[PDB]
Every structure is written in C-alpha cells, then in structure tokens.
Amino acid sequence: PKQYPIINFTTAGATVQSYTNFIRAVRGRLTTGADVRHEIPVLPNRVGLPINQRFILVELSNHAELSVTLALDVTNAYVVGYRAGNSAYFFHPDNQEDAEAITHLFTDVQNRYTFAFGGNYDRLEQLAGNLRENIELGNGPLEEAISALYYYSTGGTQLPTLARSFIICIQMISEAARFQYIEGEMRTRIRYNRRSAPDPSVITLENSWGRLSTAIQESNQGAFASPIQLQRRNGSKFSVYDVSILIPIIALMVYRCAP
Numbered sequence: 085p086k087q088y089p090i091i092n093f094t095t096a097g098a099t100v101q102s103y104t105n106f107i108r109a110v111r112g113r114l115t116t117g118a119d120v121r122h123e124i125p126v127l128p129n130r131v132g133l134p135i136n137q138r139f140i141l142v143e144l145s146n147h148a149e150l151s152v153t154l155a156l157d158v159t160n161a162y163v164v165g166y167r168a169g170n171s172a173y174f175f176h177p178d179n180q181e182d183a184e185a186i187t188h189l190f191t192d193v194q195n196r197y198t199f200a201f202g203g204n205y206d207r208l209e210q211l212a213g214n215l216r217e218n219i220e221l222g223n224g225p226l227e228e229a230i231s232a233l234y235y236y237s238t239g240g241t242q243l244p245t246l247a248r249s250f251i252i253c254i255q256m257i258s259e260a261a262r263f264q265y266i267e268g269e270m271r272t273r274i275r276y277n278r279r280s281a282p283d284p285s286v287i288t289l290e291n292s293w294g295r296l297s298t299a300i301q302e303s304n305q306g307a308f309a310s311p312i313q314l315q316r317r318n319g320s321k322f323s324v325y326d327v328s329i330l331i332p333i334i335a336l337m338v339y340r341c342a343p
C-alpha cells in the first residue's frame with residue numbers, strides 16, 4: 085500500500101485560522117512552488133509523474149468523530165475518490181492511465197467500488213437534484229457532508245445526498261485550494277457562523293479555472309490574446325485582459341506548457 089501525504093481537518097471547533105492553515109497545507113503538498121508563472125504556482129505535469137507522487141490525502145473529521153479520507157490528484161487538485169471504514173469509492177476515471185493510477189489508492193481496503201459517473205459538477209448536480217448555486221457551503225454543511233460520506237459505506241446515505249456531499253467537499257477543499265478568493269469566501273462563512281450557497285462570482289471562477297490556466301500560461305508577458313469574461317457578485321459580466329488582476333485571486337494552475 086503506497087503511502088501518500090495526509091492533511092487533517094476537523095469541523096470540531098473550526099476557526100478562520102484553522103481553516104486557513106488547512107488550505108495552505110493542501111496547497112503546499114499539491115505543488116512544489118518551483119514552477120511559478122506570473123507569481124502563480126503551477127501544478128506538476130501529469131506526463132512523466134511517478135505514481136508515488138501522484139496523490140495526496142485529506143482526512144476529514146467532524147463533531148461526531150466520524151472520519152473519511154479524500155484522495156486528491158496533484159495534477160489538477162481534484163478529488164478522485166474517498167475511503168470510509170472498510171470501503172473505498174472512486175469516480176469513473178477519464179482514461180485508462182488514470183484507471184491504473186487509482187488502483188494504488190486505499191489498497192488495504194476490503195471493498196473497492198468505482199462509480200459510473202465522474203467527479204465533474206455537471207453530473208453531480210444532476211445526481212444531487214440541485215445546482216451549486218442552491219447548495220449551501222460552510223462548517224455546518226461540511227459536518228453533514230462528512231457524515232453522509234461515512235454512512236454511504238453501509239447503505240445509510242442515499243445517492244442524491246452523497247452527490248451533494250461531494251459538491252460541498254470539492255468546493256471547500258479543491259476549489260479553495262485553487263483560488264484564494266474562494267478560500268476567502270469560506271472564511272466569511274466561518275466568520276459569520278452562517279451557511280450560504282456560493283454566489284455567481286464563485287461559480288464562474290470555478291467554471292473558468294481551466295480557461296484561466298491556459299490564458300495565463302499562453303500569455304504574451306501577461307497580456308491575453310482574447311479577454312475572459314467573469315462574473316461579479318451581482319451576476320454582471322466584466323472582461324479580464326491580462327494576468328495582473330488575477331494574482332490575488334487564483335492560487336494554483338493546471339500545467340499547460342513549459343515555463
């Protein structure tokens with residue numbers, strides 16, 4: 085059983101500081117920091133990456149002292165599957181190289197399951213019966229999401245509730261690692277001790293992460309060939325023409341080309 089780095093977070097007594105330390109620790113295991121373009125770290129190139137460096141693990145615990153372990157791909161910071169008790173569940177891999185890679189995860193588990201659906205928001209929202217804009221985020225939702233993931237192992241969680249719990253976890257871990265802006269959005273929810281759905285500025289940043297990585301890494305000294313439309317909090321659109329405005333906003337990029 086290959087050993088991958090593990091980062092722990094608990095919703096029991098969660099604070100702005102403890103959540104910040106958590107996301108910073110996840111960023112630090114996802115990248116080396118040796119490849120930066122325009123002050124923005126780039127994730128490792130999937131091509132030639134050894135299997136022993138391919139994944140990191142996030143162990144989540146809640147007030148009920150239930151624990152689940154999420155596996156994240158270091159090449160895109162996204163969850164590929166999770167372990168709860170004696171079972172492990174994996175999203176349907178996009179290719180045969182990824183199918184072979186995930187056989188090295190959670191190998192001491194007695195029961196291995198692969199879903200027919202992938203981890204993308206499009207299908208998860210369909211299984212959940214709700215769009216991201218109608219699924220509240222925060223410490224309360226994460227606490228419930230951890231319990232739902234845990235009890236799927238013994239049939240006590242229905243699939244729509246599982247899918248919604250995946251959407252909560254991916255946004256509060258993967259997307260917060262990718263964007264300081266979203267990290268700050270979860271901080272506000274903890275500061276107010278309030279749960280709320282993400283507003284259009286968050287959703288469009290999530291939808292644009294791949295396009296933003298491409299536009300930045302292809303840019304002529306930071307200047308984009310074509311503008312990228314983003315959304316304000318009130319839903320209105322504005323255009324981004326170069327990398328500078330994004331430096332405080334995006335924290336990780338998928339590898340698109342050599343530096």
Ligand SMILES: CCc1cccc(C)c1-c1ccc(C(=O)O)s1
Pocket residue numbers: 265285286289314315316317318329330333
């Ligand atoms: C997420 C879009 C974005 C990208 C880069 C820089 C900024 C300031 C932003 C804004 C977030 C919210 C805004 C509002 O409500 O008008 S603009």
Ligand SMILES: [Cl-]
Pocket residue numbers: 085086187188189191
């Ligand atoms: Cl292994």
